[PDB]
Amino acid sequence: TLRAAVFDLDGVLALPAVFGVLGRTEEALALPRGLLNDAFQKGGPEGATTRLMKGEITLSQWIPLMEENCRKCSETAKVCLPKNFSIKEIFDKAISARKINRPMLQAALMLRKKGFTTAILTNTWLDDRAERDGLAQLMCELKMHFDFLIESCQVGMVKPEPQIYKFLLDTLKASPSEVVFLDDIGANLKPARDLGMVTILVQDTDTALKELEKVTGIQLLNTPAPLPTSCNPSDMSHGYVTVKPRVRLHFVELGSGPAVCLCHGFPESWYSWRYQIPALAQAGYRVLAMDMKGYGESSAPPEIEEYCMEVLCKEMVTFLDKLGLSQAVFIGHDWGGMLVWYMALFYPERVRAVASLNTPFIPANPNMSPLESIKANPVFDYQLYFQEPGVAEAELEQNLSRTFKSLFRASDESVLSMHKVCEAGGLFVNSPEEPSLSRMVTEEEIQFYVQQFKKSGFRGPLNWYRNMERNWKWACKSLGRKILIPALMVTAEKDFVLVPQMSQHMEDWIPHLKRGHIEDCGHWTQMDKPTEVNQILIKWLDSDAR
Amino acid sequence: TLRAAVFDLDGVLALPAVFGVLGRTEEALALPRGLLNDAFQKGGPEGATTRLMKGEITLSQWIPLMEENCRKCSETAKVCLPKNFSIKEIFDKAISARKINRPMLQAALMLRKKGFTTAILTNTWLDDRAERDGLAQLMCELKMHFDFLIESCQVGMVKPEPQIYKFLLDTLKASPSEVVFLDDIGANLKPARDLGMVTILVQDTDTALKELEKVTGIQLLNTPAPLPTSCNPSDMSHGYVTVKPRVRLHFVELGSGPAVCLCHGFPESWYSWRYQIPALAQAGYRVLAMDMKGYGESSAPPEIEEYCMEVLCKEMVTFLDKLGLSQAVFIGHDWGGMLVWYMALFYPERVRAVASLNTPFIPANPNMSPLESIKANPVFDYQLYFQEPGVAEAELEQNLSRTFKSLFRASDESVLSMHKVCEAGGLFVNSPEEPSLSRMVTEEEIQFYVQQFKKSGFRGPLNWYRNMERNWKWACKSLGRKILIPALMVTAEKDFVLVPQMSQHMEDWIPHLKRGHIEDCGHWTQMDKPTEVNQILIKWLDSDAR
Numbered sequence A, B: 001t002l003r004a005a006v007f008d009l010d011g012v013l014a015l016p017a018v019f020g021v022l023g024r025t026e027e028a029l030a031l032p033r034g035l036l037n038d039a040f041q042k043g044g045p046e047g048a049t050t051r052l053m054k055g056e057i058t059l060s061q062w063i064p065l066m067e068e069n070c071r072k073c074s075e076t077a078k079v080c081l082p083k084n085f086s087i088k089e090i091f092d093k094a095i096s097a098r099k100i101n102r103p104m105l106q107a108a109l110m111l112r113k114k115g116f117t118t119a120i121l122t123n124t125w126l127d128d129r130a131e132r133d134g135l136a137q138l139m140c141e142l143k144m145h146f147d148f149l150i151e152s153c154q155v156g157m158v159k160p161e162p163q164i165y166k167f168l169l170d171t172l173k174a175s176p177s178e179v180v181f182l183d184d185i186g187a188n189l190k191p192a193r194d195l196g197m198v199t200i201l202v203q204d205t206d207t208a209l210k211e212l213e214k215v216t217g218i219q220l221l222n223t224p225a226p227l228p229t230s231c232n233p234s235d236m237s238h239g240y241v242t243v244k245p246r247v248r249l250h251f252v253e254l255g256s257g258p259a260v261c262l263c264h265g266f267p268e269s270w271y272s273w274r275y276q277i278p279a280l281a282q283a284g285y286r287v288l289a290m291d292m293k294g295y296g297e298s299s300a301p302p303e304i305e306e307y308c309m310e311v312l313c314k315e316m317v318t319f320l321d322k323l324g325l326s327q328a329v330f331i332g333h334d335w336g337g338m339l340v341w342y343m344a345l346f347y348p349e350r351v352r353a354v355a356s357l358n359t360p361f362i363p364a365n366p367n368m369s370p371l372e373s374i375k376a377n378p379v380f381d382y383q384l385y386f387q388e389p390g391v392a393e394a395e396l397e398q399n400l401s402r403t404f405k406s407l408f409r410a411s412d413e414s415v416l417s418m419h420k421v422c423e424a425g426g427l428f429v430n431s432p433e434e435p436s437l438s439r440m441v442t443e444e445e446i447q448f449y450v451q452q453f454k455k456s457g458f459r460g461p462l463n464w465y466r467n468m469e470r471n472w473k474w475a476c477k478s479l480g481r482k483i484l485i486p487a488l489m490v491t492a493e494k495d496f497v498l499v500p501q502m503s504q505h506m507e508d509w510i511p512h513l514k515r516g517h518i519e520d521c522g523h524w525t526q527m528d529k530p531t532e533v534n535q536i537l538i539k540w541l542d543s544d545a546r
């Protein structure tokens, strides 16, 4: 029967509420109990505070008016205000003290995900303080998780005026009794209830959630830890740069601050970073998530050498050049991991810092042809399979759904070994026609990749493997160097191909190397352990990249 | 006969040269004359410095080696090195002391513009110092102005080795005697001369330029002040955001740092900011230059109300939301100017700062229908012409070349009055079929705009004028407010439509308003006085937006 959920902000999605600082400040300065509240509410519907909540005046216009009200309130209660009493200072501290109430946000998320229309209905102000950005950021972080955010000052109405609920009901396209509305002020509930809305007086978060659990019949309290926020491709800023006449790079861009450039592996997509993209934006960074050369909406010229590391790197440099970036942090995984290491080696002036998921930095062996080197490790037999232009393409492009559903599996869910692939004559010779969907990906997520590879298929991605000799020669020019820029290596316990021990001697070449390890994590690091990944990268960026 | 120009970096495009700090440091610390040079050059072709210039080692690898060389040089000359003598410190100060040599850069520009292939040929290093970004930035600023930048450490060769000149001649696709090469070190010229290149030993910049003037037969010294760098559309990072199901905004993006969002007027384009885009990137900003709703590669839905200020603003907010920006600086001109003021008024939390070129902030008259208000000023008669859907479109879309060549004129070059346009029955009734090209724009620049408007024509742009009533009603909700966020107004002496005196009472509503004035500047502010515009905006951003 219930189809919509409405959440107050102050005292519901964000804690502590600011009327909570009103009261503390009083005790703090030993003023008359509730004096600051009287001043705040002075004149009711025609008072400074209503005119503010309605958008008639801005916050900075209201501050002196509140000063007056406190002068008048203090005069009538026969007390003096303290030396250097300041409404701006009190309200600054207050506003910046409030933080997202994680459990509530997460409950709203859950409800949204099980089909509810969610909204924030709040009395709030046009904030023009020097320090306004703080709140802007909060409001951003929150709004992206809700169908609507209705703000008193944007619509000209306030709680408890009954007109705002009519506006509410109308925005929701719902009837009074399909809505649950949670708010910390009883008065605000009063008219919601009159129209027939389920309401919840929010005191402690957990009881509110219990009532909301009981009334919606959906588990919200004590639910398992949720995944990090993902990206809807069609809500992203998509960017395009021609690095040279035939070749354009596509990227997706979110957040602001230092530039972090995300370099996916084989056979993937900018989408492989869906769980990192918001987290890093959120953490104060300018995420640029690439479609690497050969993939997605990036160009896929057919020639093999268009994909050697040197050309790939020169091209990432031009990418920075034309976008006007003097540096970026480079974070890569799988093949993208190889590339960021080579970026640190041949363009350190352009790399603020470098990090790889899974891909070790192993220097080339100048006394051993790299093809010979690769036969030395049976776990790498599939790379030989990839050599002959066309063979691997035909297997991979034959069923796209099949392919990704086969590759994109967690460690304990495997359906393919990379063992004797040449012998067997293929990657999927001994794996199902219709694989079960792994617990790591939804049906829709598989289709995304499917629709991407429909553009160019696998020639371009596969070409990344088809320059062993050219890349070796080039790498050898760098045997004299060391990586002395900040550098993080992250190993995945259960990557059976890029195994953690391959990284063991990396400190010989990267002396200040910082490390992270992820237990119980297969080869598809980002989607397998998104939470652990974000935690490791955000901590490392914060200490090494600012 | 001469077809290419090559410029050294250190001591030619960038001053002071670092061997210049080598020598000063000696005197400074009263060391043996030239001791630091011997150390620097120790072992010639097999010495630390060559291995570095060739890319065998990184800068940070070389630093201790140079320390040793200075220990050995000082021991052999029988002197002690000072307490806390430090190669890193000397070279940091040095590298960061060098600045672009404007006259040389400008000379190279000129030559490029008259058809020369230009290159930088430099001995340089893979820089991995903590402070490497400084040089990266220089190298960026410079490279964008040259066909090639060949770096010793990227190609494995150095000046004076003859192989680098062969590589040079080959990259240029030119023969020894079509090349002029200017360098500050005589030895580097030696092999250029052997192959038959015109060379120039660069001591003082002006004499070098005189020789280069004499030898190319092109004026380089004492030439008039050049325009700011422009943008080639196809070298830009182009971005796309869907703000809602039918509607996408296109923008061009350059630089990094605080987000500055550029909002063009009627009937224009992101391109109208071509002279601002590099300047601001250069000045440390993230320029986002819009195609506004209805223009260029942005959507152009046909309905009139899709273009009222409220919807336009809500849409710019969604633009920030999806791009992950909590604020941006908004800079607008003409209609874009109206919009940024309304952004400051209805979304100050999202506006870091606001600035308008030409467009005053005049608050709505709540006692006078805006159509009536517009008949009160004969200079605004053309806006009435624009009311009737279709009329203005047919005139404007009939000859696109004609239209922009007619509009885009400097003040003293006018071919149309905005006077009695209704009476006359059109904007161009009394103006030429084929106008002369104004001194403000090239033929190619006019074609760009032409090709843009071919996508949607003028319905969408014209609709911006077709919400007088709706916009008025909305504006009236804001009569109580003031703009208290940082705000710059820039008037144009010779804008005969948006005249400077229209801005006279703006301080009543914007108390901290900062002002700029441009003399001898028509309505198309950005292309008419690009240099003055960049100077005003960059100074104001630096003080009010950081």
Ligand SMILES: O=C(CC1CCCC1)Nc1nccs1
Binding pocket: A266, A267, A334, A335, A338, A359, A407, A497, A498, A523
């Ligand atoms: O090829 C892979 C990943 C494979 C594992 C599963 C399918 C692709 N790694 C690398 N090879 C070379 C450098 S990084």
Ligand SMILES: O=C(CC1CCCC1)Nc1nccs1
Binding pocket: B266, B267, B334, B335, B338, B359, B407, B497, B498, B523
């Ligand atoms: O219409 C213009 C500019 C015109 C002058 C030359 C052609 C267009 N200004 C504005 N009107 C309303 C707000 S800003």
Ligand SMILES: [Mg+2]
Binding pocket: A008, A009, A010, A011, A012, A017, A183, A184, A185
């Ligand atoms: Mg509340």
Ligand SMILES: [Mg+2]
Binding pocket: B008, B009, B010, B011, B012, B017, B183, B184, B185
């Ligand atoms: Mg030099």
